[PDB]
Structure formats: structure tokens, C-alpha cells
RNA sequence: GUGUAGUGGCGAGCGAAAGCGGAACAGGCCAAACUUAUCAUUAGAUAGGGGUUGUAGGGCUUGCAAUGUGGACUUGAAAACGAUAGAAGAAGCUGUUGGAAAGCAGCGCGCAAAAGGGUGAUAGCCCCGUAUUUGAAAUUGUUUUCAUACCUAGCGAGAUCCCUGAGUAGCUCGGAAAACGUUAUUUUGAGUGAAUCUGCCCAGACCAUUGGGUAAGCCUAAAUACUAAUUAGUGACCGAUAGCGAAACAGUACCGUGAGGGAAAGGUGAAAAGAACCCAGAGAUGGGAGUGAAAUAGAUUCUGAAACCAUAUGCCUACAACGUGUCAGAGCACAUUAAUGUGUGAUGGCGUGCGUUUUGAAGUAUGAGCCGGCGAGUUAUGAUAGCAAGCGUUAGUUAACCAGGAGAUGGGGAGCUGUAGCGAAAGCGAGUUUUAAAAGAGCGUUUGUUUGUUAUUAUAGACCCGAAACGGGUUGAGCUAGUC
RNA sequence: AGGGGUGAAAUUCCAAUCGAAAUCCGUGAUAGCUGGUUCUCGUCGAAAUAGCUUUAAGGCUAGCGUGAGAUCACAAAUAAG
RNA sequence: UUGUGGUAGACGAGCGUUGUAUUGGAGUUGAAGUCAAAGCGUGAGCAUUGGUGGAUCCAAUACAAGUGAGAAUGCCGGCA
RNA sequence: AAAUCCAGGUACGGGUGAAGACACCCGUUAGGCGCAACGGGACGGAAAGACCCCGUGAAGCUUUACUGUAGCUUAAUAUUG
């Protein structure tokens, strides 16, 4: 039984090409290049799925410090007044967007002083 | 069975392939080398060769051929530890052929061998017997009529 | 396959493996070796487990 | 499956994809279970017992 | 038998002969003595009878009894079975989607014929057919019967009667087929060169004994190998980059002065029904109309995707250091295989390809222009090891071969491993070799068999592709070198 | 007429090719030397050392991974003496 | 509870294509291929739907493989 | 019309890196796209480096290297008295 084997190649190439959509140049038409592009794209996605959970935390800290420098005290001092005294495991993104609800974060700000 | 539910139990094992897939588990150079000599076509040089060092089958001395150009005289052996299981008496060439012990047409002397005890009396007709085998046969009221 | 006759004259089979062989150093220059040496090497011998595979399929 | 090899039976059954006539020695293990329905001769029982 | 005996710089390797079991099976014919006739009867030559040799035979002198067994075989008469042309040869309508029914639904019909092909879709009953029964003017083949021509036959007795294959065989000098690399065996290029049944040769140097056979003459059917041809059939063989290089006016077109090397491409539509005629244009052609179910089936003619190149909706870009993607992200225009939805991505963070070879890759080493198709672990015979299966305490097991549907299987036990091993061997034996040793040491102290399958390995090119090469056979002096 | 021809000799020429033509066959010559060796997934997981080698870019044996089985404690490692 | 980086490499478990053996099914009310679509798995992959098309395919179990393409300064065919 | 071509929207200084960067790090400069020139770089294009070295490679040539051998020469022998 001589085997022709045509469907597999077409379906594999179409599936690989469909993944890389909205790509510059011919990189969305050539399967041989499309596979490399999607390889690199998924590697970047893998590294960014941790890079973003780190960068969001960085912006988290930055926007907390932005609000806390206005009260005349240090961000590290605020974390301290959370941890050792008036034990609080309060969420950082919580207290961040409690800037959006006005003055409600100020309750936590004034509560750390026993 | 039916012709729609034939089933095995433990056959149909894995089929290794030396030229399918970069990461199938077996690579492009599966089995043979990583550009070494064995990896190349017609590798795995003759089994007796040992790299250039003198072969083992030559470093050793040569055995003897005391009887030059002859075959050892073959015999048909009747061990006394197994004849007792075979249910037949007066064991003689006129009666071996019936029990399919020996080939129907074959000319060959019969050798009698054994030390294990025997209970039922037997009457051997052979060409030669071991001394203690003969003693054991005659201990149990047996008789051996030693032929020529 | 054909078994190399050059080796069938230098090995002897025994029950349950244990290929038998003769030691070398027996046909030359006796005085260079002690009489005790020839006394040891007169006996037979067997190969180790190292070269068993290269001898098995070859014989 | 027939032991006598009757001509009257074998004259018919030759234009149907479902029926065919064979001797006892001729049928194999495969065909014997491909039938889904068996019609055996009364004679073949003794020979089958003899051959086990 | 057997990878046995053996042969090998005892290396790669090489590999019998008996015997056994099968296929088929059958032995005959000349010279020689003896004799007849003829040859300038000197013939040594020509032509007739006689015998075909080992349980030695034949010729000679002399008896008995055949009238037949038979085919490597001459012709005549017939017969059967084929072969080369043909014939007969069963069975249906109705509705349905439908361009068309044969498919689909309801009730029927025949098969010694339900192989196959065609018919506006997959038809047993529409057509050719097919199983079976038949048919040969003429030619031809095989076999059968009878008659006929040539060749052929058993058992005795005597007898130191005669004959029984000449440059023959051995021997020497060099080789060669033999499994042997030269050793009896065989064969011969150079020489040497006997006997006559009281013989000669043979049984791996040779002699003797023993046993076996009659060379130096000739002939032979079947059983074995192959298929370019004809007939019929088959295919877990291929389907236009496949299949023989040749599905088409292929060894053609072409490349060569010649040996030779050697291409590519098939498919409208059921039926040409191949587009009357009109408009534009000179025309090709296109748009129409018309046939057609379909003209997006239109002569470029089945299906029509990729690199490619154009046009278009929505969005974005002209302060931008850019492997161009990824994670968040406003705005914009739409609404889906309803899915925390889709396209686009102004902006921020991060961000030096894919393979191969490598101490080491983004490389200033390499491999790819893209796209589509092809493009390498198999097969035969054996070994090893796992797994699984059947059989099992005298186990197990078939090969070739015969039987059939080109089937498993039936018969076919020839052999194979296991049952005892040890020893170089003679031989011995649960022991055996070493030895004075029964002391010790090595080995042994019954522990399967046949397959399926898997992995490795052995000989075959044995994963794929890649050389300068070697040898043998052909074609070239029209270019050129020389000569005439 | 090609392990040959010719050669006022240069390794010139012998059909643009000549340290020995073109072509066909043995021929699928061999190649320890390049490059390639196409389906995925689950578990474990090195070496670039020693010896030998007409061997040094190779191969063989040992160690190093892995599959099956045994030893489970008298065997192996960790801390202490 | 102990773990799950990974080439050379051992080893286990699976998919896909072609054909065949049966058992069921779809098909001029429209198969395959192919175009595109905002589906479902751990993967080779497997669905659904509309247009193109007018004759073959699909499901479950087995068996046999000219069998799964990214490269070989590839080769054919077309095209920047 | 061609060689080439991994996909490209392709900057510079200092440094870094398989050791001389269009992309890497830090700074600097720069509207998108043509056209005519001019060749510095992209270790540029074209030759699987001719050189060296390796291969248990090829070919040719050489001699008091090996084994042979055509031819030449001597001897026994048949042709042979």
C-alpha cells in the first residue's frame, strides 16, 4: 500500500498559520516562518506570565507610595505599622483601589496609630 | 470470538523507529551514535574485531584434534533414573522400536547408565553396562544378559 | 550465520555456560618464567563475565 | 458442513452470498465462526469426536 | 545431514561427501577373438552374421526348451479429448425526490446463470452477457485400440583352447576441478612408458590381507531452469512527480558526427446539444440572446487551495532606534460556533530567529528565496534476550513432498533441541581429567519444547545521498599533431 | 587508437575537456570523512576518564544512565566517638 | 507522603493515513477535497456550520505497512 | 535579463559578547519616500580553499624499496641421425 499522505500536511500547516494572526510582513503566510514566530511568541508569553505578575506588584508599590508620601510618612513605615503593631494582612491592591473610593483608605491610615 | 472483538493479552509491543520525529522519544540518530563510527552506514564492525588490538580468538592457544578427521562414536543412552518411569519390561531392541524410544531404523550400540535404586525386576539386553550400574541392577533381583 | 572456525578450535562448551579455554605462555622461553609459573598455567581456565557477549554469539 | 458431499445440495446455493457448501476437512476455524448459523450433518458428529 | 569433517598470512572467510527422507525411474548399442564374400586377394580395406561383459563375461565343440516379454521404436486404419470461428441461454412494474432513477419506498418474479461491463445517480429481472447445454467445412495437438517393419529371451556339458577398449595407466617436471591454498581422486602441457582372470583398478602416503568394481568405446526419455509469444484469470500491486524511461502517433522531441544520453504533458458536458443571431471592435474576443439541470461545464475545457499580484469595507502610521512579537492599555467601527466576545493597537514593561556542528551561538562559521508534491530503518535467511501462547513426564516437533480455492489444514517423524556429563582422545560414567592418590582443584549432581511478537546483532548495497578511482568492451584523425 | 596514437618535446594535442579521452558495463565500487534522517506524550538520566590499539577526528573492555530480577541489613551513606 | 529542568539515551503509554476482514450507518434531501468561521482535548489531533462539487465515504474492533517533512549548496513544477 | 536571498520597518559613539555588532548594554543623533552619484561595511556576490594538516584516500613518476613480469640470455630435453 503506497501512501500519499496529503491531509496531514495541509491541516498541520493551516493550524500553525492560524495561530499567528495579525503578523507583520509575510510572517502570517509562510508556515515555515509562522512556526518560528509562534514559537518565539509563546516563549515571550511564558516569560511575561511572570514578568507581569512582578511588574503589576511594582506598580502596586509605586502607587501606594504615591498616596502615602502625601501624609508625611514613609511607605516602609506603613508596612511596618501593618505588620508588627496592629497586625494587618490587608491586601495591597485592595488599599490601592481604596484610593478610588475617596477617603476610605484614610481610615486604615489613621487606624494604624493605636 | 467474533470478527469484531478479537483481543490479545500482552503481545503487540512497542515498535521503535530510527527515522521518525525530532522529539518522538527516538531522535534523528536513534540507536546508532552521535556522529561516531557506529552511527554511520554499515557500522558495528565484525564481532571478533577489538579495535586493532590482537583478537581474543588469536591470543589464546589452539585446542587438540587427537582423532584427526573422525566423528565420536555415538551411543544411545538408557539412564536408570528414567527407565523406571517408562512402563515396559524385557527392554530389548525388538521392543524399543514399539515404544518410540529410539528411531525405527537405526543401527547403534546401547549404553546402560545409572546409580539410582530400582524396585521392579528388569531384564536389560545391551552391549555395555557400568560396573556399579550392573551391581545395582543385580541387587533388585534383576538380570542383565550382556550381549556382544 | 557461519561460526568462525578459527575460534571453534580454541573454545569448548560446558553445561550452563562457563566457556573453557587454555592459558597462553606455554610454548616459548621456559627459563624466563619460574617452574611455579608453568605449574599454574598448565591448568585450564574460563573467561570472565566481561568478554562473554563477544564470545557467545560468535560461537 | 457435510460429510457425504451430496450433489443435490451443491447444485444449488451457488448464486447466494450467504450460503456455501463445504466438506468437514475443508472448513477452517475462521469460516466455522463466520457463519452466525450452523447446519451440521448427523454423520459428522462421530468424525468430529474421533478427531476431537 | 551441517555451518559437521575439514581447509585457510589456521585471518577475513570457505564448505563438502556418505547416509537418510522425497521428485521421477528403464537401460541399451559397437571393436575383439570365430566366420563368410570381395578387394593388382600380399589389403592392413569394404560389406554381412556374434557378443556386450564381473552373480566375470564372450567366442569355440556339442544339447534341451522358446515362438514369446517389449519399448529411447517405421508406418496404415480407426476412436476419444482438446485448440483455432459461433448458437441457445430466467426473471417488473408502481409512486417518489428529481435535468434524467437503476438509487428510495409497496407488492412481486428466477437462478446449474447474485462473475463483469454499459445504459442522463449505486439496475439480479433495461442491454450485452455470464453457469450449463451445444457447434467444426478445413487445419492441428495429445492420448487410446488393431494390424504392420527393425531390434530383442531361458537352462546344460567340455576346456591350463582363444578374446575382453595402446601413447592407454602409472612415474617425473609445472599446473588446474576438487570444501583442500596440490594429497590419494580427476584432468594434462614436456618426457618416460605394462599386464591379460594366476589380470587390472579401488577403499586420502604405502605394503600385505580382506572385500568391491571391470576404465582407457558409443547412445539415452521423464524428474530440473527459464517466459520475449498466444489464451483465460488473479492481485490487502500503482494511479499522471505514481506505474516499465513510453496512459497522448516514446526511445519520439531534443543533446551530440558517433558509442550513447535521453524529455514533458490524460479528464467539458448525459448527448456538441461546440453557441443561430445582435451590440462594440478590423479581428482575435467580450457582453448578450439560445441549447443545456448547470455556461463559475465555453473549448484555457473534473475537483481549483500556495508562494504571487491586484481592488475594496473598518482601523492605524509620517519624532521613529524596530528579530517587529508578547503582557497591560485608551480610542475607533462592528456583533459571534454567547463566548469574562471580534477586528484594529495610539501608549508603557519586556524582548539578539530556526536547524546542524560544537568547550561553546544572533553570529563577522555554517544550511535553506518562498511555495506544493516526492524524498531513509524495511525485507530474506539464522542467533541471542524479554513477553505471550499451545503441548508436558519418555516430552515437544515437522522440513522437503503429496492432496485443494494458488487456503488453514490432512498425511509425510527425514531430522532438531531436551533427557549425562567429563575428558585433547582412547574411554569412563553421577562421575569425570590431573595425578601414585579414591587427597585437592575445574566441570557435573535432570531441569523443557514448538511458535507469535518485540529489541539487538550476523550475510546480503542492509539508514539516504556524495568522490578523486580501477578493470573490461566500444566510438572517434571532419578539431588538432604527424605522414602519404 | 587510448595502461595507446602523434609529439622541431610545452605534460602539446588526440573533437572546447588529457599526469592520460568520451561512452557503457562490473556499479547501488568503497569511504573510520560531510550533510539529512519527517507523529506526539509520560518517567529516569551521563561522559568528554583508565588500559590497549599502523591508534590519536576511530574502535574494543572497564566506570558512568537505563529496563527486568535478587540482596532489606551482616550491604551502602549520613551526623558522632 | 515523596517528587515531575533536560539533550546523547533506555523505556512505557497513544494519535493519524492507506488497504483488507467482518459486524452497523450516511449519501442527487448532496460524500470527499478545498475556502473561511469568534469550537473541543495534555498532544499527534478531533468536531460543527455556509459557499464551491456531483460520486463515494463514516463509525467500533483487528491485521499489513512504498506511512506522518524545515533544512540534505536538494530534484521536479510554478511564482516573487 | 543574474548571481544572491532565515524572516526584516535595516543609524552612530563608548563598552560588552565565539575575542572587530544594523539589533545586546548605556548614551547620542535622526520627518515618510524618491532620484543622480560614490564605493567603506554588511568578515559583500560568485569557487563544499587550490595552501597546510587529517584520511590507514586517489593518480602520476622514480631507484641498488618489496614481490613479480614482458623481453633478452644460458643449460637439460623432444624435434635427432
UniProtKB/Swiss-Prot annotation, chain A:
InterPro entries found in the cross-reference section: Ribosomal_bL20, RIBOSOMAL_L20_CS, Ribosomal_protein_bL20_C
GO BP terms, alphabetized: ribosomal large subunit assembly; translation
Family from the record: Belongs to the bacterial ribosomal protein bL20 family.
CDD domains for the chain: Ribosomal_L20
GO MF terms held by the record: rRNA binding; structural constituent of ribosome
GO annotations of cellular component type: ribonucleoprotein complex; ribosome
Stated role: Binds directly to 23S ribosomal RNA and is necessary for the in vitro assembly process of the 50S ribosomal subunit. It is not involved in the protein synthesizing functions of that subunit.
One Pfam family from the record: Ribosomal_L20
Lineage: Bacteria, Bacillati, Mycoplasmatota, Mycoplasmoidales, Mycoplasmoidaceae
Top-rank taxon: Bacteria
Protein name: Large ribosomal subunit protein bL20
PANTHER family: 39S RIBOSOMAL PROTEIN L20
Cleavable signal peptide: none
UniProt source species: Mycoplasma pneumoniae (strain ATCC 29342 / M129 / Subtype 1) (Mycoplasmoides pneumoniae)
Keywords: Ribonucleoprotein, Ribosomal protein, RNA-binding, rRNA-binding
Gene giving rise to this polypeptide: rplT
Swiss-Prot record, chain B:
Residue ranges of the region described as Disordered: 1-56
Statement: the UniProt record of this protein carries the keyword Cell inner membrane: no
Name of this chain's protein: Large ribosomal subunit protein uL15
Domain of life of the native organism: Bacteria
Extent of Basic residues compositional bias: 8-19
Organism: Mycoplasma pneumoniae (strain ATCC 29342 / M129 / Subtype 1)
Function: Binds to the 23S rRNA.
Gene3D superfamilies (UniProt xref): 3.100.10.10
GO molecular function, one term: rRNA binding
Quaternary state and interactors: Part of the 50S ribosomal subunit.
GN (gene name): rplO
Regions of compositional bias (Gly residues) in chain numbering: 20-34
PANTHER family xref list: 50S RIBOSOMAL PROTEIN L15 (PTHR12934), LARGE RIBOSOMAL SUBUNIT PROTEIN UL15M (PTHR12934:SF11)
GO biological process, one term: translation
Keywords linked to the UniProt accession: Ribonucleoprotein, Ribosomal protein, RNA-binding, rRNA-binding
One Gene Ontology cellular component: cytosolic large ribosomal subunit
UniProt family annotation: Belongs to the universal ribosomal protein uL15 family.
Curated annotation (Swiss-Prot), chain C:
HAMAP family: Ribosomal_bL35
Name of the protein in its database record: Large ribosomal subunit protein bL35
One Gene Ontology cellular component: cytosolic large ribosomal subunit
Regions of compositional bias (Basic residues) in chain numbering: 30-43
Keywords in alphabetical order: Ribonucleoprotein, Ribosomal protein
One Pfam family hit: Ribosomal_L35p
Listed PANTHER family: 54S RIBOSOMAL PROTEIN BL35M, LARGE RIBOSOMAL SUBUNIT PROTEIN BL35M
Superkingdom in the source lineage: Bacteria
Gene Ontology MF annotations: structural constituent of ribosome
Biological-process GO terms, alphabetical: translation
Gene name of the encoded protein: rpmI
Family per record: Belongs to the bacterial ribosomal protein bL35 family.
Region of interest (Disordered), residue spans: 1-22, 30-49
UniProtKB/Swiss-Prot annotation, chain D:
Transmembrane segments: none
Source taxon at top rank: Bacteria
Oligomer and partners: Part of the 50S ribosomal subunit.
Protein family according to the UniProt entry: Belongs to the universal ribosomal protein uL4 family.
Function: One of the primary rRNA binding proteins, this protein initially binds near the 5'-end of the 23S rRNA. It is important during the early stages of 50S assembly. It makes multiple contacts with different domains of the 23S rRNA in the assembled 50S subunit and ribosome.
Name listed for the protein in its UniProt record: Large ribosomal subunit protein uL4
Lineage start: Bacteria, Bacillati, Mycoplasmatota, Mycoplasmoidales, Mycoplasmoidaceae
